[PDB]
PDB file of C-alpha atoms and ligand atoms in Angstrom:
ATOM      1  CA  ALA A   8      -5.697 -24.695  -3.375  1.00 51.47           C
ATOM      2  CA  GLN A   9      -8.139 -23.080  -0.936  1.00 48.69           C
ATOM      3  CA  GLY A  10      -6.404 -19.712  -0.995  1.00 51.35           C
ATOM      4  CA  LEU A  11      -9.240 -17.959  -2.804  1.00 50.14           C
ATOM      5  CA  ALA A  12     -11.898 -19.449  -0.549  1.00 53.44           C
ATOM      6  CA  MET A  13      -9.906 -18.318   2.489  1.00 52.86           C
ATOM      7  CA  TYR A  14      -9.692 -14.778   1.136  1.00 51.23           C
ATOM      8  CA  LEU A  15     -13.431 -14.677   0.371  1.00 48.08           C
ATOM      9  CA  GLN A  16     -14.701 -16.101   3.658  1.00 47.18           C
ATOM     10  CA  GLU A  17     -15.117 -13.861   6.660  1.00 46.13           C
ATOM     11  CA  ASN A  18     -11.695 -13.211   8.171  1.00 45.39           C
ATOM     12  CA  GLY A  19     -10.647 -12.369  11.706  1.00 43.45           C
ATOM     13  CA  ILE A  20      -8.567  -9.375  12.723  1.00 40.99           C
ATOM     14  CA  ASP A  21      -6.892  -9.111  16.116  1.00 40.57           C
ATOM     15  CA  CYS A  22      -5.868  -5.881  17.808  1.00 41.68           C
ATOM     16  CA  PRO A  23      -2.084  -6.095  17.979  1.00 41.23           C
ATOM     17  CA  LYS A  24      -2.115  -4.124  21.254  1.00 43.82           C
ATOM     18  CA  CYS A  25      -4.877  -5.697  23.385  1.00 47.22           C
ATOM     19  CA  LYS A  26      -5.292  -8.981  21.427  1.00 45.68           C
ATOM     20  CA  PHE A  27      -9.085  -8.586  21.132  1.00 44.74           C
ATOM     21  CA  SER A  28     -10.544 -10.626  18.260  1.00 45.94           C
ATOM     22  CA  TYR A  29     -12.935  -9.176  15.675  1.00 46.74           C
ATOM     23  CA  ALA A  30     -14.544 -10.222  12.434  1.00 47.21           C
ATOM     24  CA  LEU A  31     -13.117  -8.148   9.581  1.00 46.93           C
ATOM     25  CA  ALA A  32     -15.603  -5.924   7.783  1.00 45.59           C
ATOM     26  CA  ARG A  33     -14.207  -4.993   4.383  1.00 44.57           C
ATOM     27  CA  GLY A  34     -15.016  -1.703   2.687  1.00 46.24           C
ATOM     28  CA  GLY A  35     -13.082   0.737   4.843  1.00 44.62           C
ATOM     29  CA  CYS A  36      -9.564   2.164   4.573  1.00 44.48           C
ATOM     30  CA  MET A  37      -6.294   0.794   6.002  1.00 43.31           C
ATOM     31  CA  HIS A  38      -6.615   2.849   9.218  1.00 43.04           C
ATOM     32  CA  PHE A  39      -8.076   0.546  11.872  1.00 45.40           C
ATOM     33  CA  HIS A  40      -9.035   1.706  15.352  1.00 44.27           C
ATOM     34  CA  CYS A  41      -9.552  -0.935  18.021  1.00 43.49           C
ATOM     35  CA  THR A  42     -12.969  -0.281  19.627  1.00 41.22           C
ATOM     36  CA  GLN A  43     -11.810  -1.733  22.935  1.00 40.96           C
ATOM     37  CA  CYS A  44      -8.484   0.038  23.509  1.00 37.71           C
ATOM     38  CA  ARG A  45      -8.424   2.729  20.771  1.00 35.36           C
ATOM     39  CA  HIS A  46      -5.120   1.480  19.339  1.00 34.81           C
ATOM     40  CA  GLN A  47      -4.706   2.548  15.714  1.00 34.83           C
ATOM     41  CA  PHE A  48      -3.001   0.086  13.358  1.00 32.50           C
ATOM     42  CA  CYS A  49      -2.592  -0.950   9.737  1.00 34.58           C
ATOM     43  CA  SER A  50      -4.852  -3.732   8.478  1.00 31.88           C
ATOM     44  CA  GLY A  51      -2.077  -4.857   6.164  1.00 33.61           C
ATOM     45  CA  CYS A  52       0.901  -5.276   8.457  1.00 35.68           C
ATOM     46  CA  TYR A  53      -0.420  -4.619  11.970  1.00 35.16           C
ATOM     47  CA  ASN A  54       2.119  -1.897  12.618  1.00 33.49           C
ATOM     48  CA  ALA A  55       0.994   1.133  14.585  1.00 37.17           C
ATOM     49  CA  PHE A  56      -0.293   4.357  13.057  1.00 34.30           C
ATOM     50  CA  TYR A  57       1.141   7.427  14.745  1.00 29.95           C
ATOM     51  CA  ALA A  58      -0.773  10.701  14.642  1.00 30.30           C
ATOM     52  CA  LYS A  59       1.017  13.914  13.621  1.00 27.01           C
ATOM     53  CA  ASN A  60       4.161  14.597  15.665  1.00 27.83           C
ATOM     54  CA  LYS A  61       3.947  11.562  17.973  1.00 25.23           C
ATOM     55  CA  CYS A  62       5.984   9.048  15.964  1.00 25.16           C
ATOM     56  CA  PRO A  63       9.163   7.663  17.655  1.00 22.84           C
ATOM     57  CA  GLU A  64      11.640   7.490  14.719  1.00 22.57           C
ATOM     58  CA  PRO A  65      14.294  10.097  13.879  1.00 24.30           C
ATOM     59  CA  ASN A  66      14.127  11.071  11.247  1.00 26.63           C
ATOM     60  CA  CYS A  67      10.847   9.953   9.787  1.00 28.68           C
ATOM     61  CA  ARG A  68      10.366  12.467   6.948  1.00 30.60           C
ATOM     62  CA  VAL A  69       6.617  11.753   7.132  1.00 31.89           C
ATOM     63  CA  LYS A  70       6.782  12.671  10.860  1.00 31.66           C
ATOM     64  CA  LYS A  71       4.456  15.656  10.652  1.00 31.39           C
ATOM     65  CA  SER A  72       1.598  13.445   9.522  1.00 29.77           C
ATOM     66  CA  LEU A  73      -0.577  10.492  10.418  1.00 30.63           C
ATOM     67  CA  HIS A  74       1.454   7.513   9.237  1.00 30.32           C
ATOM     68  CA  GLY A  75       2.783   4.055   9.975  1.00 28.57           C
ATOM     69  CA  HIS A  76       6.070   2.370   9.146  1.00 29.17           C
ATOM     70  CA  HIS A  77       5.042  -0.386   6.767  1.00 27.75           C
ATOM     71  CA  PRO A  78       7.270  -3.287   5.661  1.00 25.49           C
ATOM     72  CA  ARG A  79       7.869  -3.692   1.944  1.00 22.98           C
ATOM     73  CA  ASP A  80       5.456  -6.614   1.776  1.00 25.37           C
ATOM     74  CA  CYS A  81       2.501  -4.740   3.272  1.00 22.91           C
ATOM     75  CA  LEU A  82      -0.546  -4.319   1.026  1.00 20.26           C
ATOM     76  CA  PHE A  83       0.124  -0.592   1.522  1.00 19.06           C
ATOM     77  CA  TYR A  84       2.894  -0.996  -1.088  1.00 14.71           C
ATOM     78  CA  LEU A  85       1.805  -4.103  -2.965  1.00 14.45           C
ATOM     79  CA  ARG A  86      -1.634  -2.760  -3.945  1.00 15.63           C
ATOM     80  CA  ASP A  87       0.265  -0.532  -6.409  1.00 17.09           C
ATOM     81  CA  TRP A  88       1.705  -3.492  -8.329  1.00 20.53           C
ATOM     82  CA  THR A  89       0.026  -4.794 -11.468  1.00 24.27           C
ATOM     83  CA  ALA A  90      -1.758  -8.136 -11.108  1.00 27.66           C
ATOM     84  CA  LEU A  91       0.764  -9.508 -13.614  1.00 28.17           C
ATOM     85  CA  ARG A  92       3.701  -8.579 -11.383  1.00 29.53           C
ATOM     86  CA  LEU A  93       2.053  -9.975  -8.225  1.00 25.15           C
ATOM     87  CA  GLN A  94       1.401 -13.149 -10.224  1.00 23.39           C
ATOM     88  CA  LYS A  95       5.067 -13.272 -11.194  1.00 20.56           C
ATOM     89  CA  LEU A  96       6.216 -13.179  -7.577  1.00 23.04           C
ATOM     90  CA  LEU A  97       3.935 -16.154  -6.871  1.00 24.06           C
ATOM     91  CA  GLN A  98       4.930 -18.011 -10.039  1.00 25.42           C
ATOM     92  CA  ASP A  99       8.651 -17.508  -9.371  1.00 26.34           C
ATOM     93  CA  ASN A 100       8.114 -19.275  -6.046  1.00 26.73           C
ATOM     94  CA  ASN A 101       5.879 -22.122  -7.225  1.00 27.83           C
ATOM     95  CA  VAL A 102       2.740 -20.857  -5.518  1.00 29.11           C
ATOM     96  CA  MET A 103      -0.548 -21.688  -7.235  1.00 31.43           C
ATOM     97  CA  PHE A 104      -3.298 -19.061  -7.579  1.00 37.30           C
ATOM     98  CA  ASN A 105      -6.723 -18.727  -9.217  1.00 38.66           C
ATOM     99  CA  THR A 106      -7.484 -16.890 -12.448  1.00 36.52           C
ATOM    100  CA  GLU A 107     -10.985 -18.329 -12.812  1.00 38.25           C
ATOM    101  CA  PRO A 108     -13.839 -18.418 -10.260  1.00 39.70           C
ATOM    102  CA  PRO A 109     -14.581 -21.696  -8.407  1.00 39.72           C
ATOM    103  CA  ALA A 110     -16.082 -24.333 -10.718  1.00 39.64           C
ATOM    104  CA  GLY A 111     -19.218 -24.268  -8.585  1.00 39.53           C
ATOM    105  CA  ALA A 112     -19.672 -20.520  -8.214  1.00 42.83           C
ATOM    106  CA  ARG A 113     -22.832 -18.475  -7.666  1.00 44.24           C
ATOM    107  CA  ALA A 114     -24.227 -15.564  -9.695  1.00 44.07           C
ATOM    108  CA  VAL A 115     -23.701 -12.134  -8.133  1.00 42.53           C
ATOM    109  CA  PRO A 116     -26.888 -10.021  -8.258  1.00 46.19           C
ATOM    110  CA  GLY A 117     -26.152  -6.737 -10.021  1.00 41.89           C
ATOM    111  CA  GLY A 118     -22.370  -7.136  -9.988  1.00 40.64           C
ATOM    112  CA  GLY A 119     -19.714  -7.628 -10.660  1.00 40.36           C
ATOM    113  CA  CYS A 120     -17.161  -8.420  -7.959  1.00 39.65           C
ATOM    114  CA  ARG A 121     -18.386 -10.930  -5.361  1.00 41.69           C
ATOM    115  CA  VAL A 122     -16.450  -9.638  -2.337  1.00 43.15           C
ATOM    116  CA  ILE A 123     -18.850  -8.624   0.422  1.00 42.08           C
ATOM    117  CA  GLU A 124     -18.276  -5.084   1.707  1.00 42.21           C
ATOM    118  CA  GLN A 125     -19.856  -3.086   4.490  1.00 44.67           C
ATOM    119  CA  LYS A 126     -20.671  -0.049   2.333  1.00 41.97           C
ATOM    120  CA  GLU A 127     -21.705   3.460   3.311  1.00 41.43           C
ATOM    121  CA  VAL A 128     -25.262   4.248   2.220  1.00 43.82           C
ATOM    122  CA  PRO A 129     -27.620   7.117   3.160  1.00 43.11           C
ATOM    123  CA  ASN A 130     -28.084   6.856   6.950  1.00 44.82           C
ATOM    124  CA  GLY A 131     -25.701   4.026   7.824  1.00 46.15           C
ATOM    125  CA  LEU A 132     -24.002   0.894   6.535  1.00 45.99           C
ATOM    126  CA  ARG A 133     -25.151  -1.999   4.366  1.00 43.84           C
ATOM    127  CA  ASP A 134     -23.528  -5.330   3.556  1.00 46.68           C
ATOM    128  CA  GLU A 135     -23.401  -5.647  -0.225  1.00 49.24           C
ATOM    129  CA  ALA A 136     -21.298  -7.228  -2.967  1.00 49.19           C
ATOM    130  CA  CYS A 137     -18.493  -5.008  -4.230  1.00 51.43           C
ATOM    131  CA  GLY A 138     -20.004  -5.118  -7.711  1.00 51.95           C
ATOM    132  CA  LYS A 139     -17.056  -3.565  -9.562  1.00 51.11           C
ATOM    133  CA  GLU A 140     -16.060  -4.779 -13.048  1.00 49.94           C
ATOM    134  CA  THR A 141     -14.513  -8.255 -13.133  1.00 45.84           C
ATOM    135  CA  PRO A 142     -11.721  -8.540 -15.747  1.00 45.32           C
ATOM    136  CA  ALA A 143     -11.032 -11.880 -17.416  1.00 48.17           C
ATOM    137  CA  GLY A 144      -8.502 -13.881 -15.433  1.00 53.99           C
ATOM    138  CA  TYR A 145      -9.191 -12.114 -12.137  1.00 56.17           C
ATOM    139  CA  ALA A 146     -11.117 -15.054 -10.622  1.00 55.19           C
ATOM    140  CA  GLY A 147     -14.442 -13.208 -10.490  1.00 52.47           C
ATOM    141  CA  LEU A 148     -12.962 -10.382  -8.455  1.00 52.17           C
ATOM    142  CA  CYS A 149     -12.375  -6.738  -9.423  1.00 56.00           C
ATOM    143  CA  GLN A 150      -8.869  -5.368  -9.966  1.00 53.87           C
ATOM    144  CA  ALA A 151      -8.367  -4.163  -6.404  1.00 54.39           C
ATOM    145  CA  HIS A 152      -9.788  -7.222  -4.686  1.00 56.68           C
ATOM    146  CA  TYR A 153      -7.909  -9.592  -6.998  1.00 55.26           C
ATOM    147  CA  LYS A 154      -4.670  -7.854  -5.955  1.00 56.98           C
ATOM    148  CA  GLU A 155      -5.611  -8.208  -2.251  1.00 52.80           C
ATOM    149  CA  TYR A 156      -6.159 -11.929  -2.873  1.00 52.08           C
ATOM    150  CA  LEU A 157      -2.735 -12.303  -4.492  1.00 49.21           C
ATOM    151  CA  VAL A 158      -1.138 -10.322  -1.657  1.00 48.02           C
ATOM    152  CA  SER A 159      -2.759 -12.664   0.890  1.00 48.87           C
ATOM    153  CA  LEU A 160      -0.893 -15.542  -0.802  1.00 50.30           C
ATOM    154  CA  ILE A 161       2.351 -13.599  -1.076  1.00 48.30           C
ATOM    155  CA  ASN A 162       2.248 -12.836   2.643  1.00 48.17           C
ATOM    156  CA  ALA A 163       1.175 -16.350   3.635  1.00 47.86           C
ATOM    157  CA  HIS A 164       4.284 -17.742   1.926  1.00 47.81           C
ATOM    158  CA  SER A 165       6.689 -15.017   3.134  1.00 45.35           C
ATOM    159  CA  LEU A 166       7.575 -14.021  -0.410  1.00 44.75           C
ATOM    160  CA  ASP A 167       9.910 -11.041  -0.759  1.00 42.68           C
ATOM    161  CA  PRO A 168       8.801  -8.425  -3.327  1.00 43.55           C
ATOM    162  CA  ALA A 169      12.382  -7.051  -3.444  1.00 44.09           C
ATOM    163  CA  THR A 170      13.375 -10.029  -5.588  1.00 44.96           C
ATOM    164  CA  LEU A 171      11.569  -8.294  -8.460  1.00 45.71           C
ATOM    165  CA  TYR A 172      12.643  -4.698  -7.736  1.00 43.15           C
ATOM    166  CA  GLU A 173      14.320  -2.609 -10.408  1.00 41.48           C
ATOM    167  CA  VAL A 174      17.377  -0.611  -9.297  1.00 42.52           C
ATOM    168  CA  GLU A 175      15.312   2.556  -8.711  1.00 41.95           C
ATOM    169  CA  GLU A 176      12.979   0.596  -6.421  1.00 43.08           C
ATOM    170  CA  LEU A 177      15.939  -0.835  -4.511  1.00 42.42           C
ATOM    171  CA  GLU A 178      17.297   2.702  -4.085  1.00 40.49           C
ATOM    172  CA  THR A 179      13.943   4.015  -2.841  1.00 41.55           C
ATOM    173  CA  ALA A 180      13.479   1.107  -0.409  1.00 42.29           C
ATOM    174  CA  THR A 181      17.058   1.594   0.760  1.00 43.20           C
ATOM    175  CA  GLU A 182      16.472   5.285   1.517  1.00 49.21           C
ATOM    176  CA  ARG A 183      13.264   4.422   3.325  1.00 45.87           C
ATOM    177  CA  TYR A 184      14.448   1.611   5.600  1.00 47.58           C
ATOM    178  CA  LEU A 185      18.162   2.335   5.984  1.00 45.83           C
ATOM    179  CA  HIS A 186      17.905   6.137   5.933  1.00 45.48           C
ATOM    180  CA  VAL A 187      20.742   6.468   3.412  1.00 43.20           C
ATOM    181  CA  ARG A 188      20.667   7.374  -0.282  1.00 41.19           C
ATOM    182  CA  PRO A 189      22.734   4.663  -1.968  1.00 41.14           C
ATOM    183  CA  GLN A 190      25.000   5.169  -4.944  1.00 42.72           C
ATOM    184  CA  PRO A 191      27.355   2.971  -6.985  1.00 42.24           C
ATOM    185  CA  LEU A 192      30.840   2.561  -5.561  1.00 41.22           C
ATOM    186  CA  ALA A 193      33.767   3.430  -7.794  1.00 38.78           C
ATOM    187  CA  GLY A 194      34.485   0.438 -10.030  1.00 43.78           C
ATOM    188  CA  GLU A 195      31.032  -1.041  -9.465  1.00 46.32           C
ATOM    189  CA  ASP A 196      29.080  -1.808 -12.649  1.00 45.17           C
ATOM    190  CA  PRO A 197      25.282  -1.445 -12.853  1.00 44.43           C
ATOM    191  CA  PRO A 198      24.486  -5.161 -12.386  1.00 45.66           C
ATOM    192  CA  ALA A 199      26.850  -5.436  -9.394  1.00 43.83           C
ATOM    193  CA  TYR A 200      25.287  -2.328  -7.905  1.00 43.49           C
ATOM    194  CA  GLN A 201      21.764  -3.791  -8.148  1.00 43.52           C
ATOM    195  CA  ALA A 202      22.942  -7.086  -6.650  1.00 44.10           C
ATOM    196  CA  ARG A 203      24.586  -5.294  -3.708  1.00 45.98           C
ATOM    197  CA  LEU A 204      21.436  -3.253  -2.967  1.00 45.56           C
ATOM    198  CA  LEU A 205      19.256  -6.367  -3.069  1.00 42.17           C
ATOM    199  CA  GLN A 206      21.712  -8.216  -0.840  1.00 43.18           C
ATOM    200  CA  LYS A 207      21.887  -5.412   1.722  1.00 45.32           C
ATOM    201  CA  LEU A 208      18.128  -4.863   1.825  1.00 45.82           C
ATOM    202  CA  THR A 209      17.391  -8.559   2.305  1.00 45.86           C
ATOM    203  CA  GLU A 210      19.846  -9.059   5.173  1.00 44.55           C
ATOM    204  CA  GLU A 211      19.137  -5.778   6.966  1.00 45.01           C
ATOM    205  CA  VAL A 212      15.412  -5.122   6.579  1.00 46.70           C
ATOM    206  CA  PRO A 213      13.133  -8.009   7.486  1.00 44.06           C
ATOM    207  CA  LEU A 214       9.750  -8.596   5.891  1.00 41.42           C
ATOM    208  CA  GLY A 215       6.774  -7.657   8.071  1.00 40.71           C
ATOM    209  CA  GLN A 216       7.300  -9.043  11.558  1.00 40.22           C
ATOM    210  CA  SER A 217       3.592  -8.927  12.446  1.00 36.43           C
ATOM    211  CA  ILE A 218       2.177 -10.217   9.148  1.00 33.81           C
ATOM    212  CA  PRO A 219       0.738 -13.692   9.868  1.00 31.84           C
ATOM    213  CA  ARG A 220       2.597 -16.454   7.993  1.00 31.13           C
ATOM    214  CA  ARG A 221       2.070 -20.091   7.104  1.00 28.02           C
ATOM    215  CA  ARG A 222       3.610 -22.092   9.959  1.00 26.99           C
ATOM    216  CA  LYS A 223       4.557 -25.518   8.582  1.00 24.45           C
TER     217      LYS A 223
ATOM    218  CA  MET B   1      -8.198   6.950   3.563  1.00 24.95           C
ATOM    219  CA  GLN B   2      -7.124   5.998   0.042  1.00 25.55           C
ATOM    220  CA  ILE B   3      -6.350   8.545  -2.661  1.00 25.31           C
ATOM    221  CA  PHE B   4      -4.772   7.990  -6.080  1.00 30.40           C
ATOM    222  CA  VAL B   5      -1.911   9.850  -7.743  1.00 28.50           C
ATOM    223  CA  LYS B   6      -1.509   9.533 -11.516  1.00 28.31           C
ATOM    224  CA  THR B   7       1.085  10.982 -13.881  1.00 25.38           C
ATOM    225  CA  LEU B   8       1.021  11.620 -17.631  1.00 28.17           C
ATOM    226  CA  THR B   9       1.563   8.831 -18.279  1.00 26.52           C
ATOM    227  CA  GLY B  10       1.966   7.217 -16.061  1.00 26.13           C
ATOM    228  CA  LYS B  11       1.367   4.657 -13.339  1.00 27.39           C
ATOM    229  CA  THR B  12      -1.308   5.282 -10.739  1.00 26.00           C
ATOM    230  CA  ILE B  13      -0.093   5.014  -7.181  1.00 22.41           C
ATOM    231  CA  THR B  14      -2.064   4.968  -3.966  1.00 25.61           C
ATOM    232  CA  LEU B  15      -1.541   6.849  -0.726  1.00 22.19           C
ATOM    233  CA  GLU B  16      -3.116   6.455   2.721  1.00 19.74           C
ATOM    234  CA  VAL B  17      -4.021   9.900   3.994  1.00 17.87           C
ATOM    235  CA  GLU B  18      -6.397  11.774   6.261  1.00 13.09           C
ATOM    236  CA  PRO B  19      -8.346  14.844   5.084  1.00 14.74           C
ATOM    237  CA  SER B  20      -6.299  17.055   7.417  1.00 15.55           C
ATOM    238  CA  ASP B  21      -3.043  16.114   5.642  1.00 15.11           C
ATOM    239  CA  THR B  22      -1.192  19.073   4.185  1.00 15.88           C
ATOM    240  CA  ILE B  23      -0.105  19.069   0.528  1.00 14.18           C
ATOM    241  CA  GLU B  24       3.442  19.055   1.908  1.00 14.12           C
ATOM    242  CA  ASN B  25       2.576  15.845   3.760  1.00 12.04           C
ATOM    243  CA  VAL B  26       1.256  14.319   0.555  1.00 11.30           C
ATOM    244  CA  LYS B  27       4.439  15.146  -1.349  1.00 13.34           C
ATOM    245  CA  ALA B  28       6.486  13.540   1.415  1.00 11.89           C
ATOM    246  CA  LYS B  29       4.351  10.392   1.125  1.00 14.48           C
ATOM    247  CA  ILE B  30       4.956  10.309  -2.634  1.00 13.96           C
ATOM    248  CA  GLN B  31       8.709  10.701  -1.990  1.00 12.71           C
ATOM    249  CA  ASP B  32       8.635   7.794   0.489  1.00 16.50           C
ATOM    250  CA  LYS B  33       6.845   5.596  -1.981  1.00 17.88           C
ATOM    251  CA  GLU B  34       8.303   6.643  -5.322  1.00 20.85           C
ATOM    252  CA  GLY B  35      11.562   8.490  -4.572  1.00 21.96           C
ATOM    253  CA  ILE B  36      10.545  11.759  -6.246  1.00 22.67           C
ATOM    254  CA  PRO B  37      11.752  14.848  -4.342  1.00 18.58           C
ATOM    255  CA  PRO B  38       8.874  17.116  -3.188  1.00 19.84           C
ATOM    256  CA  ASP B  39      10.569  20.106  -4.866  1.00 21.93           C
ATOM    257  CA  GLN B  40      10.048  18.321  -8.211  1.00 22.48           C
ATOM    258  CA  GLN B  41       6.364  17.558  -7.610  1.00 23.29           C
ATOM    259  CA  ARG B  42       3.413  19.546  -8.879  1.00 23.19           C
ATOM    260  CA  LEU B  43       0.069  18.122  -7.762  1.00 22.24           C
ATOM    261  CA  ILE B  44      -3.209  19.092  -9.440  1.00 25.28           C
ATOM    262  CA  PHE B  45      -6.811  18.293  -8.496  1.00 26.14           C
ATOM    263  CA  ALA B  46      -9.713  19.137 -10.801  1.00 27.66           C
ATOM    264  CA  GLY B  47      -7.511  21.603 -12.665  1.00 25.71           C
ATOM    265  CA  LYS B  48      -6.495  23.296  -9.419  1.00 27.48           C
ATOM    266  CA  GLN B  49      -2.828  23.603  -8.445  1.00 28.24           C
ATOM    267  CA  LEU B  50      -2.304  22.328  -4.894  1.00 29.02           C
ATOM    268  CA  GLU B  51      -0.325  24.609  -2.559  1.00 28.48           C
ATOM    269  CA  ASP B  52       2.007  23.235   0.134  1.00 27.51           C
ATOM    270  CA  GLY B  53       0.481  24.737   3.280  1.00 24.55           C
ATOM    271  CA  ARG B  54      -3.129  23.911   2.482  1.00 26.29           C
ATOM    272  CA  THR B  55      -4.823  20.604   3.305  1.00 26.38           C
ATOM    273  CA  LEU B  56      -6.699  17.989   1.289  1.00 24.61           C
ATOM    274  CA  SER B  57      -9.953  19.060   2.937  1.00 25.09           C
ATOM    275  CA  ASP B  58      -9.319  22.654   1.761  1.00 25.64           C
ATOM    276  CA  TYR B  59      -9.659  21.345  -1.804  1.00 25.02           C
ATOM    277  CA  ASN B  60     -12.588  18.997  -1.070  1.00 25.46           C
ATOM    278  CA  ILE B  61     -10.375  15.991  -1.776  1.00 25.79           C
ATOM    279  CA  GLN B  62     -12.142  12.881  -0.491  1.00 26.84           C
ATOM    280  CA  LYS B  63     -11.870   9.078  -0.569  1.00 29.10           C
ATOM    281  CA  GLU B  64     -10.590   7.664  -3.878  1.00 30.55           C
ATOM    282  CA  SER B  65     -10.096  11.117  -5.405  1.00 28.67           C
ATOM    283  CA  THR B  66      -7.420  11.210  -8.107  1.00 28.76           C
ATOM    284  CA  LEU B  67      -4.618  13.755  -8.039  1.00 27.47           C
ATOM    285  CA  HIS B  68      -2.401  14.419 -11.024  1.00 27.42           C
ATOM    286  CA  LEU B  69       1.358  14.529 -10.608  1.00 28.72           C
ATOM    287  CA  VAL B  70       3.427  16.600 -13.023  1.00 26.58           C
ATOM    288  CA  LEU B  71       7.206  16.867 -12.673  1.00 26.50           C
ATOM    289  CA  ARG B  72       8.702  20.335 -12.198  1.00 30.20           C
ATOM    290  CA  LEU B  73      11.732  21.470 -14.152  1.00 33.44           C
ATOM    291  CA  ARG B  74      13.890  24.355 -12.929  1.00 31.00           C
ATOM    292  CA  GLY B  75      16.913  25.833 -14.683  1.00 28.52           C
ATOM    293  CA  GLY B  76      20.339  25.546 -13.101  1.00 30.31           C
TER     294      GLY B  76
HETATM  295 ZN1  LIG C 301      -7.057  -3.112  21.226  1.00 29.61          ZN
HETATM  296 ZN1  LIG C 302       0.881  -1.685   6.669  1.00 29.83          ZN
HETATM  297 ZN1  LIG C 303       7.463   7.784  11.671  1.00 29.39          ZN
HETATM  298 ZN1  LIG C 304     -14.186  -5.937  -5.672  1.00 29.85          ZN
HETATM  299 ZN1  LIG C 305      -8.075   6.165   6.465  1.00 29.42          ZN
END
């Protein structure tokens, strides 16, 4: 309904540590640093970023690096999906989404994608439309911003991307969150194996616990 | 900071890194995301083979740079 408008308007972002409220400026990476308390966190899932060798989890194989522990529904993972696959997750769950711009839209000067970014320019920053190519069916947004829009809807409705995982993806997610490399049990056929992995992942690894959700 | 990793061919995946990340760190991030063991990963940037102990900044790898991933095959 108003999902696209809500993505396009200026959003807030709150420091998960000190609760300070900001206006989100798009255009940067996923590493956010609170200017008030210096807490570093992911813009997608609000989990903490740990610098090299200060992460708490044994054994985080990415321990020797700057990293966070992102849930499977963080944009960190979902930005790699095709728009078609993100659309399928929404469609499978009866969630409407835009493929065309608002009926009463407004021409973007130069562009291109209409999303306003704070861009780096010689000697500072400048607010400017994204301007990237806008494929048909991407609601007037570029590929990356269209995917962010779809992810905003996926997260709002607490949709689980694992429902669409292939067996290899279930195995990878299993290794990541449950720290064990799964394998078929003796007597277990490939479909039963996939079903077991999906079942175990769903009941043992929650979706992002700090991703804001529709509360109704 | 976002970088891209593409195979041949080949989905493009994204990683969040910092310029001081080692190539070893990058391979571990690819393993986390895609399940490919680091020992099977060969990463290339602008025709240059990336060596484990060096960092992204050593190779002038910056925001939205694209790395190429080629699978390694060893005999038994
Ligand atoms: Zn803070
Ligand atoms: Zn995240
Ligand atoms: Zn960790
Ligand atoms: Zn855009
Ligand atoms: Zn960054």
